[PDB]
């Protein structure tokens, strides 16, 4: 009742009528690459990394924002999907500078755990690499806005849960930027909690800045006691 069997790689599963292709393929234990998407946020689509070749169609669709019709064959690995996940993640790895000796998210960036598995082998660009300038906002958010692959993820968070309407999009085409037009500081509750959301190492912590790389720590779970909600 209230379901459609969709053959995800030729294998049945019953979802709600009106869910997403991403949640369907994640239900059967698979990962499609995720840049312009978050579960705890709204949904946009302007990275165009999830691209699956749907069966009985010459075109390619993106799994972020579309419903699922009567049961398709969501052909995950094809000889054309790998001509797309290689495709998009060759452009955005060009207009970007050669950091990571010094990029402080250097052990967990999503241009670094996608780029071994998916994507191409070498480069053919071979000169270019625009370089914008940075600024300061508060004494907590160490700020390199050069890297900033414009996935529109920090931007919606101002309209999301933290209701401070502060950020925007300034520019057109190749040249757009993310930061505040005026030099207004941005600080309230949750204001230091953006540096987890930024999926590359363009945003990071100010006191933590230059200490140690994230493959030497020992992750032990615990609880903080500085408030009554735990």
């Amino acid at each position: 009742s209230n379901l459609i069997e969709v053959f995800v790689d030729g294998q049945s599963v019953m979802v709600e009528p009106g869910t997403t292709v991403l949640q369907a393929c994640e239900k059967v234990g698979m990962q499609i690459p995720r840049f312009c998407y978050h579960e705890r946020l709204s949904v946009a689509g302007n990275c165009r990394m999830c691209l699956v070749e749907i069966e009985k169609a010459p075109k390619v669709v993106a799994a972020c924002a579309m419903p699922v019709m009567k049961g398709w064959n969501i052909l995950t690995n094809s000889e054309k999907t790998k001509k797309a996940r290689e495709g998009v993640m060759e452009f955005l790895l060009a207009n970007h500078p050669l950091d990571c000796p010094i990029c402080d998210q250097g052990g967990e960036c999503d241009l670094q755990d996608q780029s071994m598995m998916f994507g191409s082998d070498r480069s053919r660009f071979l000169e270019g690499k625009r370089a914008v300038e940075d600024k300061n906002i508060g004494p907590l958010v160490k700020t390199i806005m050069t890297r900033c692959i414009q996935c529109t993820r920090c931007i919606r968070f101002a309209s999301e849960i933290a209701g401070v309407d502060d950020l925007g999009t300034t520019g057109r085409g190749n040249d757009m930027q993310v930061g505040t037009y005026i030099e207004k500081m941005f600080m309230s509750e949750l204001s230091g909690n953006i540096i987890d959301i930024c999926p590359v190492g363009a945003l990071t912590s100010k006191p933590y800045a230059f200490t140690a790389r994230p493959w030497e720590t020992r992750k032990t779970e615990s609880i903080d006691v500085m408030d009554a909600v735990g």
Binding site: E79, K82, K83, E86, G119, S120, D121, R122, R124
Partner: protein, 52 residues
């Protein structure tokens, strides 16, 4: 000389295959700067992933 042929009566006679390469006709040095060819499908427009 007379100490020479006593080495040539004993255990045959070699006179050329010395146990040292310390003399001449050991390769001393090499001049040119090297450059390496980059061959195996390193190029573009056909060399392309999902084929390899």
């Amino acid at each position: 000389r007379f100490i020479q042929w006593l080495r040539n009566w004993a255990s045959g006679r070699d006179l050329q295959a010395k146990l040292q390469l310390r003399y001449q006709e050991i390769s001393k040095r090499t001049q040119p700067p090297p450059k390496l060819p980059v061959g195996p499908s390193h190029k573009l427009s056909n060399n392309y992933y999902c084929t390899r």
